[PDB]
Amino acid sequence: PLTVPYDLPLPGGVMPRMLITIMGTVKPNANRIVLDFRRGNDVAFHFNPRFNENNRRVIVCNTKQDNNWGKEERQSAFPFESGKPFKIQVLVEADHFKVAVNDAHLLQYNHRMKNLREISQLGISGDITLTSANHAMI
Amino acid sequence: LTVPYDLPLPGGVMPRMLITIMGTVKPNANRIVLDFRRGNDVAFHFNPRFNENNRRVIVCNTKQDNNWGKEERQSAFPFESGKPFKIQVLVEADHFKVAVNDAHLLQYNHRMKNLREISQLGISGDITLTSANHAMI
Ligand SMILES: Cc1nc2ccc(-n3ncnc3[C@@H]3O[C@H](CO)[C@H](O)[C@H](n4cc(-c5cc(F)c(F)c(F)c5)nn4)[C@H]3O)cc2s1
Ligand SMILES: Cc1nc2ccc(-n3ncnc3[C@@H]3O[C@H](CO)[C@H](O)[C@H](n4cc(-c5cc(F)c(F)c(F)c5)nn4)[C@H]3O)cc2s1
């Protein structure tokens, strides 16, 4: 039983083969969800499911450095349903993040910020209840 | 061994199976392919491409009912034209894991879940093969 927003510390930074697993439930009339892998006030990887952008559901990914966003990467596969439980797994590899939801591959996001040791927090927020958040090696 | 080569997987694939392949990339290689086959379906296709829009990339996918799915792509590219390599593929309960020259390269979650039905590993494209075997670890 965790609270939201939740900043999961990643004390040593991220490394290849780290698998982060987040379990929770989408709030019944959710509008947005966010996972932010942060390096200080910069966001190495922002993963943002939007339940209604111009009447579509879309996940937007991007990077924030010095208070500026970059080029968005967008994906319409949308495995989240309002009110329903979900398992998100983020696998960190040497060149990208890979995300799977409910054990199914969703997307990949190539590293823009290359200093993986400095990514030391994962911010989890938006319209969810959070049951658990941890990581392991695979 | 001669390429293309089909490595039989007599009891299919199962967690803890390790496959080890040694060969050499041809100096003018364009593509390499490892295909875990179940009939016409390919549970996991591993496809290093040496020149796709002037980049090297590895493309992974699954073919089921004659249709490919969503690709997983890797820019980490451990193969060099002309050079020997070692590929190991470990089957785990949740995914295949692939290491090249003893370094982790990628993982690929299972999409086709009936692993015991995978009967052959096809090895082809721009390589020469010194050996290919499987063991349980
Ligand atoms: C170079 C660029 N200039 C712009 C200008 C505008 C935008 N627009 N237009 C709509 N929304 C955006 C922005 O897109 C970003 C992704 O590219 C972030 O998602 C950004 N954003 C969302 C959130 C957020 C905060 C929360 F508390 C949440 F719970 C939550 F779920 C999301 N914080 N920042 C969002 O405002 C994008 C860009 S890229
Ligand atoms: C839903 C989809 N619609 C498309 C449309 C086009 C493609 N494009 N566009 C370029 N190449 C592709 C295809 O990507 C596939 C993986 O997603 C396979 O690699 C597919 N392919 C390569 C090979 C192959 C055969 C050989 F004998 C080799 F030696 C060898 F090294 C590779 N067999 N099949 C390839 O043609 C992909 C997709 S997925």
Cα–Cα distance, B43 to A99 (Å, whole number) = 20
Method: X-ray
Cα–Cα distance, A45 to B43 (Å, whole number) = 30
Cα–Cα distance, A78 to B27 (Å, whole number) = 43
Cα–Cα distance, B66 to B82 (Å, whole number) = 33
Q: Which residue has the tokens 């590895």?
A: B58
Q: Does residue A39 lie within any of the structural domains?
A: yes
Give how many domains chain B has, as a whole number: 1
Among B47, B72, B128, which residue has the most ligand 2 atoms within 8 Å of its CB, making it the best to mutate?
B47
- Those residues whose C-beta lies under 8 Å from the C-beta of residue A20, and which sit 6 or more positions away, are A8, A89, A90, A91, A92, A122, A133, A134, A135
Q: Are A98 and A88 in contact (CB under 8 A)?
A: no
Measured between CB atoms, does B97 come within 8 Å of chain A?
Answer: yes
- Those residues whose C-beta lies under 8 Å from the C-beta of residue B117, and which sit 6 or more positions away, are B12, B38
Q: Does residue A1 lie within any of the structural domains?
A: no
Q: Is the peptide bond before A28 cis (omega within 30 degrees of 0)?
A: no
- Using alpha carbons only, what angle is made at residue A106 by residues A111 and A112, rounded to the nearest 5 degrees? 10
Q: Does residue A46 lie within any of the structural domains?
A: yes
Tokens of B19: 């496959």
In this structure, are strands B72-74 and B67-68 parallel, antiparallel, or unpaired?
unpaired
Q: Are B84 and B27 in contact (CB under 8 A)?
A: no
Q: Are A48 and A32 in contact (CB under 8 A)?
A: yes
Q: Which atom of ligand 2 is nearest the CA belonging to B124?
A: 29
Q: Min CA distance, A95 vs chain B (Å)?
A: 6
Cα–Cα distance, A64 to A47 (Å, whole number) = 11
Measured between CB atoms, does A87 come within 8 Å of chain B?
Answer: no
The answer to the question of whether A75 is labelled as a binding residue is yes
Q: Is the peptide bond before B4 cis (omega within 30 degrees of 0)?
A: yes
Q: Does residue A34 lie within any of the structural domains?
A: yes
* Cβ–Cβ gap B74/A91 under 8 Å: no
Q: Min CA distance, B97 vs chain A (Å)?
A: 9
Cα–Cα distance, B127 to B129 (Å, whole number) = 7
Q: Which residue has the tokens 């398992």?
A: A87
Q: Does residue A128 lie within any of the structural domains?
A: yes
Nearest residue to B73 via CA among B53, B91, B88? B53
Cα–Cα distance, A17 to A38 (Å, whole number) = 18
Q: Min CA distance, B90 vs chain A (Å)?
A: 12
- B chain contacts of residue A102, beta-carbon cutoff 8 Å: none
Main-chain dihedrals φ then ψ at residue A3, nearest 5 degrees: -115, 160
Measured between CB atoms, does B55 come within 8 Å of chain A?
Answer: no
Tokens of A128: 């969810």
In this structure, are strands A96-101 and A104-110 parallel, antiparallel, or unpaired?
antiparallel
Cα dihedral A31, A36, A40, A41 in deg (nearest 10):
-30
Which residues of B are annotated as part of the binding site for a beta-D-galactoside?
Answer: 68-74
Measured between CB atoms, does A91 come within 8 Å of chain B?
Answer: yes
Q: Which residue segment(s) compose the domain that A47 sits in? A: 6-137
Coil, helix or strand at residue B59: strand
CATH number at residue B77: 2.60.120.200
Among A7, A31, A34, which residue has the most ligand 1 atoms within 8 Å of its CB, making it the best to mutate?
A34
Tokens of B127: 């390589």
Cα–Cα distance, A25 to A48 (Å, whole number) = 15
Cα–Cα distance, B69 to A125 (Å, whole number) = 31
Q: Are B77 and B48 in contact (CB under 8 A)?
A: yes
Q: Are B28 and B104 in contact (CB under 8 A)?
A: no
Measured between CB atoms, does B72 come within 8 Å of chain A?
Answer: yes
Nearest residue to A10 via CA among A123, A94, A120? A120
Main-chain dihedrals φ then ψ at residue A55, nearest 5 degrees: 70, 15
Cα–Cα distance, A87 to B52 (Å, whole number) = 34
CA quadruple B64, A97, A127, A68: dihedral positive or negative? negative
Amino acid at A2: L
Size of interface A-B (CB pairs under 8 A): 29
Coil, helix or strand at residue B99: strand
Residues in chain A, how many?
138
- A chain contacts of residue B76, beta-carbon cutoff 8 Å: 93-95
Cα of A71 vs its chain's centroid, Å: 17
